Design an enzyme around this catalytic site. Structure first.
Site, PDB file in Angstrom:
ATOM      1  N   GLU E  64       2.541   7.069   6.321  1.00  0.00           N
ATOM      2  CA  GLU E  64       2.126   5.734   5.904  1.00  0.00           C
ATOM      3  C   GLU E  64       1.563   5.771   4.483  1.00  0.00           C
ATOM      4  OE1 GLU E  64       3.012   3.043   7.318  1.00  0.00           O
ATOM      5  OE2 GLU E  64       2.106   2.706   9.285  1.00  0.00           O
ATOM      6  N   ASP E  65       2.481   6.039   3.551  1.00  0.00           N
ATOM      7  CA  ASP E  65       2.241   6.229   2.119  1.00  0.00           C
ATOM      8  C   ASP E  65       0.859   6.792   1.805  1.00  0.00           C
ATOM      9  OD1 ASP E  65       1.398   3.603   2.955  1.00  0.00           O
ATOM     10  OD2 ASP E  65       1.820   2.704   1.038  1.00  0.00           O
ATOM     11  N   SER E  66       0.549   7.958   2.359  1.00  0.00           N
ATOM     12  CA  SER E  66      -0.490   8.832   1.839  1.00  0.00           C
ATOM     13  C   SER E  66       0.165   9.924   1.006  1.00  0.00           C
ATOM     14  CB  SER E  66      -1.317   9.458   2.962  1.00  0.00           C
ATOM     15  OG  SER E  66      -1.907   8.470   3.777  1.00  0.00           O
ATOM     16  N   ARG E 229      11.311   0.527   1.001  1.00  0.00           N
ATOM     17  CA  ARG E 229      11.004  -0.046  -0.301  1.00  0.00           C
ATOM     18  C   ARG E 229      12.155   0.062  -1.286  1.00  0.00           C
ATOM     19  NH1 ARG E 229       5.062   2.955  -0.266  1.00  0.00           N
ATOM     20  NH2 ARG E 229       4.742   2.481   1.950  1.00  0.00           N
TER      21      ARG E 229
ATOM     22  N   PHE F 432      -2.170   3.308   4.783  1.00  0.00           N
ATOM     23  CA  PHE F 432      -3.013   4.074   3.871  1.00  0.00           C
ATOM     24  C   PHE F 432      -2.631   3.849   2.418  1.00  0.00           C
ATOM     25  CE2 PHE F 432      -2.316   6.793   7.722  1.00  0.00           C
ATOM     26  CZ  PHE F 432      -3.425   6.333   8.387  1.00  0.00           C
TER      27      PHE F 432
END
Ligand SMILES: [Mg+2]
Ligand SMILES: [Zn+2]
Ligand SMILES: [Zn+2]
Ligand SMILES: [Zn+2]
Lengths: 151, 98, 233, 95, 238, 581, 109, 44, 205, 227
Positions: E64-66, E229, F432
């Site tokens: 989750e886009d970390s 994206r 996040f």
């Protein structure tokens, strides 16, 4: 095959002899109410809310809750402030919390409204916690168990 | 840091309370509100300086305590300042048969 | 065109009924000067004096020459051409009502301008200069003429009154117009604090075009935020 | 003149488990701490007498103190400018 | 999203930063011209670094886009810099005055505050200030106390010798606080294609995955961040 | 004396008349000076009897400090009456239904006798009543008009001269009306129109007007009240001089601006009383429905694959800032002693103790000589691993937006984020990319019991909305399960030796299974290890996987052992595990 | 501020109530604690232990939440559940008094 | 961002009907502009 | 048109009401020409109690739907007939319900004779066999003692129930009155049909 | 709107729902199961569910009850399909307890394979299933009234109709043949226990739940407006 039209007239289609009168299905909730009764209005409300939610929509008991609240007085009452007056006129505090506190406060004062404390907004505005789940049931100390099997 | 409207709605939806009592009352503006119970208007009580009175019906005072929040008391004071008399019925006492 | 214009001509008016059917230009000019000019609180005392009527009529005509369609001119000899242009404007409006034309695209850049620093500062400055300079000066001169006779006074008195009247403001007003930029204080100074997050942020701050309107719940709010086809380039 | 008067009151219990062990005696003890020797409701309460009615030890809802209140209906002997039994005081006065 | 993030990006925020006293400004020490630059970089200074990014799954800490960040890349100076704050206070009138209050006549001393390390009413430069330390001490009724407490939990360093002369012809404090800001766990990073990501992993240089020829990444970004994206510009840039 | 516990059963609203204000106010305001020394001026609009806003004194009336004092109203005896700003529409309705000279109703009460009570007055006001005749007293009723330059003033033209309806003779007219007229018009006995006009207004308690801004409005009101002579006895046609008239108008407008400034209803520079109620930042929606709370923390959230779904990563600094209240009893003094003796210096320490013998709180920096606790003492101790914490993300749209996670304190000081498993995001609809989430640790015993028994996130595993599960494998874990469970890799059969099979179970925190039956060169299948995990909770599952799609099928050769997933009593022997499963 | 006006339409001591208790053979509410009622009982007992400290558990526990939870589980909770939905204008409260030592316990796990 | 001066902007009144606004600036950038609003009303 | 469907379904409505027809059914042509002729049409039925219930079918452009005095005369002479007259029924065009004068006459007549019930309905209430409509559940009236025992089990006051207007189609077809309780078998997608009881409130006009 | 002690949803004291979900079930305790009789034909229904191993009109009564339940379900949900636009009849319903899973668990935990025929045990199993189905509506009441056999309110009899259908479908004698009497009593106890666990709680703020659950899809309705 069947006919899906634009615009609603249950009365005329019911009057027409080339179409089935018992299976009129109309999107509008007002027309459905006015020519079929409050129960059919309730069913139409459930159907319309379900259609709006779509496939991902919630459990059916939530749509049932919506319809049963909005039709509990025999007429389709809205969720707007007017519906709140229609359903809960004695709850001054809830209506003050929703919108226009000045107007409803003045109306309650002139009407000398006696507001019973129930629900969520009425006790919250009085600085008390609502009587719901953890505090729905009174807990009383067990006198005989303490006297006999305690101390 | 704010526990807004929707947080209260969520805690209600969980039937929480207690936590609501903690976070709102015991942690923001918890206060004890005294009401005469004989006239329904706010009263005056002080345990140390033994004051037990209400201005509305003086001798007939039967004060009880109601847990409230300073915000609610201030809101009631504002409603009275607008010449609206906020009188509280209070829960009746309940007794079991002899 | 003829049908709608005749209907509009014959329709009564709540206010201008006395001059509705008046063919006398002077009477209508006097009526309008009574209605719009300040300082005329009893429009019957001055009526007897022909010079007061002359003053009102001449003042009203000069005001309209300056005010109505000034871009065509600001003198008396341009009145017919101003009326020609006004007729052209009415023609265009009623063409749009025909659906012969579409309404002006409120978001297209064919009819939009960007006014920065100079124009905005001048437009705020005229108002601020008026309020903070002309008003104190006029007040001081009125007070001085209260204190001394209109003939008795001397030139040094006039100069001292001028200089003292402005003691008190212009800088504070200009700085508040800059700092606030708040659309109703309606201020036309689109201003933002210069946050120096980096060089790119600063240069994009200096290259920013702000609509700075209000727009309620409507399709307008969505439509004016979209990428219009006149944006490219 | 002394007389018998019936009073209504809601107590407050700081430790309901201790209190409920001997409910009647504990109730009389709390009452004689609270009402004996004080003017209350147009009466003076010289002496405490038996409780006509009481209530189960409800636990307070609107607070997390774990305390109970209980409602009590007791008869007590009282010494009933007509007269001013100013509440909370240990003597009357009708000077 | 990139148009927003590139303007939010920390870098050389002002070329004359030492002369200024700016509130909440971050000066990133090291900047790099992108290996894939654009015409925009003829006119503005680039802000960022050419971090080596591995588009791989590593322990699931980058879901989750970390972003998984090499602790060594943090330590060596990557995305580090100085973060500035300013505290300015003016006297209400001649009644007030800067200075360490006397314990007796103060009558309004702060509860448990330091009040030491003040010289002439100001904390000298190079002094580490904690959440209880009193800076720009200021008493009134000359008594009474109106001194200023540091407040922030993160300790700072003082570097400002100035008590200017304001427009109302009065003095005021205007001290500047300097913060040592590396890339902490929780700071946001983003590629020029608009992929934000909160840095949550501090892996020593040995724990970082490495190629056959010793190359290891600075950031490990999750491959799942791409397909929804469609930020193919980032992959082509790589 | 006992103030017994009680709960507000119902609330009644009424018009506040002169008598209500007279018996409610604790004192009388007749002095214009605000402050007289450090103490507020006695008898002014700041008199301590109304309340305290400073810790330097007590309320006198209640003998409480600023914290426990709730304020008390005052009375300002106006030298001329004023109309109540809220009920100007009611006043207009009342003037136009009753006779001005005698007070008896001029409308036929029998017409509205049958009608529903609240609307009777509105229908009565709808009647013109212009030039009507009053039978009982033989007086023609005039026309009541409302002034257009203000909200409060009333006029009256009787086919002629327009006399002003001052509050005084309005009080007279309303006093003429009797209870029967009011009752038969549907209004309550407490809704008598004589209460609409006030001679002794109520000055609000200082608790609602602190200052050392509406107090300015009240002060000007008091001064203008002083500027009015006390003997005003206006009758209908007293033609009072312009100075008294303008002063009374100023006093009425000042009262109206004190109450209803910048507020317009269907009826009708410090913001007035009623302006403070509405809108989001008003009294109601910002103070009552919401609240600002102590003992709460906020920070950025970030992923952590080592935490259980029911666990949240809590930085040690926050755990040192937030406290948990644990009372000292016989059963916990042994456990609570290390928290005490660690103090401010070491984790897990504590810095607060509430001594019951002193009924005050103490900082452990000065508790060296006491050195011990006792039964009945309350010790506030730092959060530790295993504590339950409430975890919230605005906007809070779902029932699961606030869940209780178990605290896992990360002792590394460099970390300041809230760490939580990626599979837990589905509760809060979080990611996040920079999201910030609230976290407060319950400290009361009731709150902790309630949290861990009712608000635990296990209760929100099944959605209340759609009755399905919300948590599962997202992105990384979904593709990982697909890779692990598939039949063939590009290298051939999807097998692993015993060492790597054990490596898979290294970090599951469960009880690792028994690999004693496998040779070091034995090749374990992926379905094998998945089954050794699933046997702990044996279930039956048979469904096609999302990996198998008809749209792809013509291209790429699906392995027939992957397009059907079958689990029998925890033995995954078919297919792959992906989003569907 | 203008209230956008649709302007829609519509003895201060209550008489004491006598607590009438439904006989155990006429109780219609479920004989199993709701999770709300179980949570409330555990919280009330845990706080009461926090303030008093006495216990009836033969096993030592270091935390009141655990003692209260185990007291609920082992069916020795010294608290009755009063379920009440009725208040008659006649001044009478109709309640059902349930002993949790006889009621079934919800999951709570 | 400002509408163009000396240009007639005609947008529908979505008691009024179509409305045209013409802001006339006599000269350069700095001259004060007098706005004239033409309305076509439902009264005709 | 509304009239022919009305003609068949009104006798259907009387059949559902379990009431015996007194007047013989005329053919459609005579009925429709009489509606314009006399401005109305009278149908009489007798209940199981053996009381007379009357029905009035008004044409849209009839005599008695236009003004007040004619309407007043019609009802005044009809209620002067020597009949038990347990209920009387008006059927008028839908806009006619918004002609407040006619409702004023009907209200004042109801006041004049309170011992019998007067109701006014539009056509659509009788232009179909309403109980047989799919969207309408099965309404049925329960007796007073059955409703009373239901309420006593639930400790409910009659006003605490959900309210149903007496102007609802199926309640009218049932013949329900205010103060009566109606039991409804409503289909459900969560429990596969469920039963509710509603309290009948005075009809809206 | 708060669920009271009768599991009605009421404003203060005024009813809004005679029973919360019309079934009294928490939305978090539901599972989608298949009703195997809805789509079958009469001959197929006889083949699959009618029992022939024991001669008795008792099992004919059982099958007739099953067929009547199927006819009912068909009629109600056909009408529901009728008065809607595109909501069709489905044989997958959300029920509190999946009886099939319990039966599978007991069969996989069985002590033996196919049991020898036992007519007395078959009759006892059917009789106890019938008794359990008749006493099922007492889950909304209590076990005291179940023991006293006090009459069930009509709406409570209607609430359990779907579950009575499911139990009669899954515990049919054709499917129960390999289940012993002790195993069947255990199955009945498990069904009753899960049904009790699935009931809504006294005092749940169900109005808030409905509001949240309906307002969440409104955001996606906005997002899908452009489509
Ligand atoms: Mg985010
Ligand atoms: Zn009192
Ligand atoms: Zn006080
Ligand atoms: Zn009169």
């Amino acid at each position: 095959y069947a006919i899906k039209t634009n615009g609603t007239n249950i009365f005329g289609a019911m009057l027409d002899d080339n179409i089935d009168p018992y299976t009129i299905v109309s999107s509008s909730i007002g027309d459905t109410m006015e020519l079929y009764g409050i129960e059919a209005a309730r069913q139409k409300i459930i159907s319309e809310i379900r259609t709006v939610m779509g496939d991902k929509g919630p459990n059916h008991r939530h749509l049932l809750m919506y319809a049963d609240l909005m039709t509990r007085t025999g007429q389709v009452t809205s969720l707007e402030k007017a519906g709140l007056n229609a359903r809960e006129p004695s709850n001054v505090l809830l209506r003050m919390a929703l919108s226009s506190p000045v107007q409803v406060l003045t109306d309650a004062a002139v009407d000398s409204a006696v507001n019973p404390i129930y629900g969520i907004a009425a006790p919250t505005l009085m600085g008390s916690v609502p009587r719901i789940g953890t505090m729905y049931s009174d807990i009383i100390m067990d006198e005989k168990y303490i006297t006999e099997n305690y101390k | 840091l704010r526990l807004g409207e929707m947080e209260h709605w969520v805690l209600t939806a969980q039937g929480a309370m207690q936590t609501i009592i903690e976070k709102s009352h015991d942690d923001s503006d918890g206060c004890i509100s005294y009401i005469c119970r004989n006239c329904g208007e706010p009263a005056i009580y002080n345990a140390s300086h033994p004051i037990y009175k209400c201005m509305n019906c003086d001798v007939q005072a039967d004060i009880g305590m109601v847990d409230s929040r300073r915000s609610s008391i201030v809101f009631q004071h504002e409603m009275r300042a607008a010449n609206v008399n906020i009188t509280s019925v209070l829960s009746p006492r309940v007794f079991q048969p002899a | 065109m003829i049908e709608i214009l005749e209907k509009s001509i014959h329709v009564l008016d709540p206010i201008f009924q006395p001059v509705q059917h008046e063919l006398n230009r002077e009477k209508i000019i006097q009526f309008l000067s009574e209605k719009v000019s300040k300082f005329v609180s009893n429009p019957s005392a001055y009526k007897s004096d022909e010079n007061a009527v002359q003053y009102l009529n001449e003042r009203q005509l000069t005001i309209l020459d300056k005010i109505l369609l000034p871009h065509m001119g600001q003198t008396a000899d341009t009145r017919v051409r101003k009326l020609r242009f006004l007729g052209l404007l009415i023609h265009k409006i009623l063409l749009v009502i025909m659906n012969v034309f579409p309404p002006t695209d409120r978001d297209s850049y064919r009819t939009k301008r960007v006014h920065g620093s100079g124009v905005s500062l001048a437009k705020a400055f005229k108002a601020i200069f008026n309020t903070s300079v002309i008003a104190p000066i006029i007040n001081g001169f009125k007070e001085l003429l209260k204190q001394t006779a209109f003939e008795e006074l001397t030139q040094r008195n006039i100069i001292e009154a001028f200089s003292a009247a402005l003691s008190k403001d212009l800088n504070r007003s200009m700085e508040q117009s800059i700092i606030s930029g708040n659309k109703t204080i309606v201020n036309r100074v689109s201003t933002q604090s210069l946050e120096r997050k980096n060089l790119l942020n600063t240069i994009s701050a200096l290259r920013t075009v702000n609509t700075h309107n209000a727009s309620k719940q409507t399709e307008r709010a969505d439509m004016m935020r979209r990428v219009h086809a006149s944006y490219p380039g | 003149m002394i007389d018998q008067k019936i009073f209504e009151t809601t107590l407050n219990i700081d430790d309901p488990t201790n209190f409920c062990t001997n409910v009647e005696a504990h109730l009389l003890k709390e009452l004689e701490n609270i009402y004996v020797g004080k003017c209350f409701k147009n009466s003076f309460i010289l002496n405490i007498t038996g409780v006509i009615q009481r209530s189960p030890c409800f636990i307070m809802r609107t607070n997390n103190s774990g305390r109970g209140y209980m409602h009590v209906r007791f008869s007590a002997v009282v010494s009933y400018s007509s007269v001013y039994y100013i509440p909370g005081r240990q003597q009357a006065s009708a000077t | 999203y990139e148009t927003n993030q590139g303007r939010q990006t920390g870098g050389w925020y002002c070329f004359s930063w030492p002369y200024r006293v700016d509130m909440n400004r971050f000066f990133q020490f090291y900047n790099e011209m992108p290996l894939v630059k654009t015409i925009a970089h003829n006119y503005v200074i680039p802000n960022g670094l050419n971090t080596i990014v591995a588009y791989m799954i590593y322990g699931g800490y980058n879901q989750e886009d970390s972003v998984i960040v090499s602790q060594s890349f943090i330590d060596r100076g990557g995305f580090a810099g100085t973060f500035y704050r300013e505290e300015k206070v003016e006297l209400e009138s001649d009644i007030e005055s800067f200075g360490k209050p006397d314990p007796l006549i103060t009558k309004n001393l702060k509860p448990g505050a330091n009040y030491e390390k003040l010289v002439d009413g100001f904390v000298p430069v190079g002094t580490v200030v904690k959440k209880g330390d009193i800076i720009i001490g200021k008493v009134a009724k000359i008594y009474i106390d109106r001194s200023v407490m540091y407040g922030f939990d993160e300790p700072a360093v003082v570097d400002a010798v100035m008590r200017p002369h304001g427009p109302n012809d009065e003095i005021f404090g205007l001290m500047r606080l300097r913060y040592e800001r590396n890339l902490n766990i929780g700071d946001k990073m983003s590629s020029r294609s608009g992929n934000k990501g909160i840095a949550a992993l501090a892996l020593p240089t040995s724990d970082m995955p490495f190629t056959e020829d010793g190359l290891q990444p600075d950031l490990i970004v999750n491959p799942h961040s791409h397909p929804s994206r469609m930020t193919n510009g980032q992959m082509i840039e790589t | 004396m006992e103030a017994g516990y009680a709960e507000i059963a119902a609330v009644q609203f009424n018009i506040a008349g002169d008598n209500d204000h007279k018996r409610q106010g604790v004192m009388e305001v007749t002095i214009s000076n605000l402050f007289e020394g450090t103490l507020p001026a006695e008898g002014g609009i700041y008199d301590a009897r109304m309340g305290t806003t400073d810790h330097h004194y007590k309320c006198i009336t209640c003998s409480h400090q600023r914290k426990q004092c709730m304020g008390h109203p005052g009375i300002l005896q106006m030298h001329a009456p004023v109309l109540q700003p809220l009920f100007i529409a009611e006043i207009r309705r009342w003037l136009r239904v009753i006779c001005l000279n005698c007070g008896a109703p001029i409308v036929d009460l029998k017409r509205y006798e049958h009608l529903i009570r609240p609307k009777r007055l509105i229908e009565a006001a709808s009647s013109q009543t212009e030039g009507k005749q009053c039978y009982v007293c033989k007086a023609v009723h005039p026309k009541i008009v409302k002034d257009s330059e203000d909200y409060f003033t009333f006029w009256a033209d009787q086919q002629g001269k327009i006399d002003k309806l001052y509050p005084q003779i309005i009080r007279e007219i309303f006093s003429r009306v009797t209870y029967d007229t009011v009752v038969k018009l549907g209004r309550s006995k407490n809704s008598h129109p004589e209460k609409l006009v006030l001679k002794a207004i109520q000055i609000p308690p200082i608790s609602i007007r602190p200052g050392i801004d509406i107090n300015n409005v009240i002060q000007y009101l008091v001064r203008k009240n002083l500027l009015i002579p006390k003997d005003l006895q206006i009758v209908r046609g007293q033609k009072i001089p312009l100075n008294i008239d303008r002063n009374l108008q100023t006093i009425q407008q000042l009262y109206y601006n004190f109450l209803l400034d910048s507020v317009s209803t269907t009826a009708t520079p410090a913001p007035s009383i009623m302006r403070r109620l509405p809108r989001k930042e008003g009294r109601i929606r910002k103070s009552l429905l919401g609240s600002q709370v102590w003992s709460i923390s906020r920070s950025t959230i970030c992923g952590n694959s080592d935490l259980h779904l029911d666990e949240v990563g809590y930085p040690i600094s926050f755990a040192r800032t937030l406290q948990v209240a644990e009372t000292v009893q016989h059963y916990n003094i042994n456990r609570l002693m290390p928290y005490f003796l660690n103090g401010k210096r070491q984790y897990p320490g504590c810095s607060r103790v509430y001594k019951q013998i002193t009924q005050s709180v103490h900082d452990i920096e000065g508790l060296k000589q006491d050195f011990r606790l006792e039964v009945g003492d309350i010790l506030y101790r730092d959060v530790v691993t295993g504590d339950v914490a409430f975890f919230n993300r605005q906007p809070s749209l779902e029932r699961s937006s606030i869940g209780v996670h178990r605290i896992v304190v990360l002792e590394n000081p460099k970390i300041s984020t809230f760490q939580m498993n990626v599979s837990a995001c589905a509760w809060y609809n979080a990611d996040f990319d920079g999201d910030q989430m609230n976290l407060w640790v319950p400290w009361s015993v009731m709150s902790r019991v309630e949290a861990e028994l009712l608000c635990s996130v296990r209760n929100w595993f099944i959605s209340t909305k759609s009755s399905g599960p919300v948590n599962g494998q997202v992105q990384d874990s979904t593709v990982g399960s697909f890779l692990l469970t598939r039949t063939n890799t590009p290298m051939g059969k999807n097998v692993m030796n015993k060492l790597h099979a054990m490596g898979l179970f290294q970090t599951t925190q469960t009880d690792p299974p028994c690999f004693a039956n496998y040779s070091p060169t034995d090749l374990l299948d992926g379905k094998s290890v998945v089954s050794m995990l699933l046997r702990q909770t044996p279930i039956n599952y048979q469904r096609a996987p999302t990996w198998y799609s008809e749209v792809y099928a013509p291209y790429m050769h699906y392995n027939k052992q992957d397009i059907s997933t079958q689990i029998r009593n925890g033995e995954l022997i078919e297919g792959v595990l992906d989003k569907k499963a | 501020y203008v209230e956008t006006e649709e302007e829609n339409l519509v003895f201060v001591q209550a008489s004491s109530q006598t607590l009438v208790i439904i006989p155990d053979n006429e109780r219609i509410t479920s004989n199993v604690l709701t999770t709300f009622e179980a949570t409330r009982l555990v919280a009330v007992r845990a706080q009461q232990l926090a303030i008093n400290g006495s216990t009836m558990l033969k096993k030592k526990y270091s935390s009141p939440i655990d003692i209260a939870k185990q007291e609920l589980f082992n069916r020795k909770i010294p608290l009755l559940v009063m379920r009440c939905i009725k208040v008659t204008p006649e001044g009478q409260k109709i309640v059902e008094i349930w002993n949790p030592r006889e009621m079934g316990i919800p999951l709570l796990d | 961002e400002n509408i163009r001066f000396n240009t007639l902007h005609i947008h529908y009144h979505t008691n009024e009907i179509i409305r045209g606004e013409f802001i006339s600036q006599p000269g350069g950038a700095f001259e004060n502009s007098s706005q004239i609003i033409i309305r076509y009303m439902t009264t005709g | 048109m509304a009239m022919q469907k009305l003609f068949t379904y009104i006798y259907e409505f009387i059949e559902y009401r379990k009431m015996v027809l007194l007047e013989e059914k005329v053919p459609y042509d005579k009925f429709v020409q009489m509606v314009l002729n006399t401005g109305f049409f009278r149908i009489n039925a007798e209940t199981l109690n053996h009381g007379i219930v009357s029905v009035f079918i008004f044409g849209a452009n009839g005599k008695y739907v236009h003004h007040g005095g004619d309407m007043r005369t019609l009802l005044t002479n009809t209620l002067n007939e020597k009949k038990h007259y347990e209920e009387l029924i008006l059927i008028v065009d839908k806009p006619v319900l918004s002609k407040k004068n006619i409702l004023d006459i009907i209200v004042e007549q109801r006041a004049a004779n309170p011992t019998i019930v007067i109701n006014i309905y539009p056509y659509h209430l009788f232009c179909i066999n309403i109980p047989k409509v799919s969207a309408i559940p099965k309404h049925k009236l329960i007796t007073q003692e059955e409703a009373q025992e239901f309420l006593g089990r639930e400790y409910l006051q009659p006003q605490d129930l959900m309210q149903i207007s007496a102007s609802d189609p199926p309640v009218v077809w049932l013949g329900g009155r205010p103060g009566d309780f109606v039991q409804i078998e409503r289909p459900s997608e969560t429990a596969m049909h469920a039963v509710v009881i509603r309290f009948i409130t005075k009809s809206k006009i | 709107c708060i669920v009271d002690y009768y599991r009605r949803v009421s404003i203060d004291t005024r009813l809004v729902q005679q029973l919360y979900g019309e079934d009294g079930l928490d939305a978090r305790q539901l599972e989608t199961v298949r009703f195997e009789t809805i789509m079958l034909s009469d001959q197929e229904l006889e083949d699959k569910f009618k029992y022939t191993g024991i001669q008795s009109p008792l099992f004919e009564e059982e099958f007739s009850r099953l067929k009547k339940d199927r006819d009912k379900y068909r009629q109600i949900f056909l009408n529901v399909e009728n008065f809607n636009f595109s909501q069709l009849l489905t044989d997958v319903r959300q029920v509190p307890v999946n009886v099939a899973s319990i039966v599978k668990n007991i069969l996989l935990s069985s002590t033996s394979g196919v049991l020898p025929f036992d007519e007395k045990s078959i009759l006892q199993k059917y009789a106890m299933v019938k008794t359990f189905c008749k006493n099922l509506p007492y889950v909304f009441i209590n076990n005291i009234q179940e023991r006293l056999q006090t009459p069930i309110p009509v709406y409570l009899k209607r609430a359990a109709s779907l579950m009575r259908m499911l139990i009669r479908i899954e515990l049919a004698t054709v499917k129960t043949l390999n289940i012993t009497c002790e195993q069947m009593s255990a199955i009945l106890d498990l069904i009753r226990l899960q049904y009790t666990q699935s009931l809504i709680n006294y005092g749940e703020a169900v109005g808030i739940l409905a509001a949240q659950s309906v307002s969440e899809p409104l955001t996606q309705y906005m997002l899908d407006s452009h489509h």
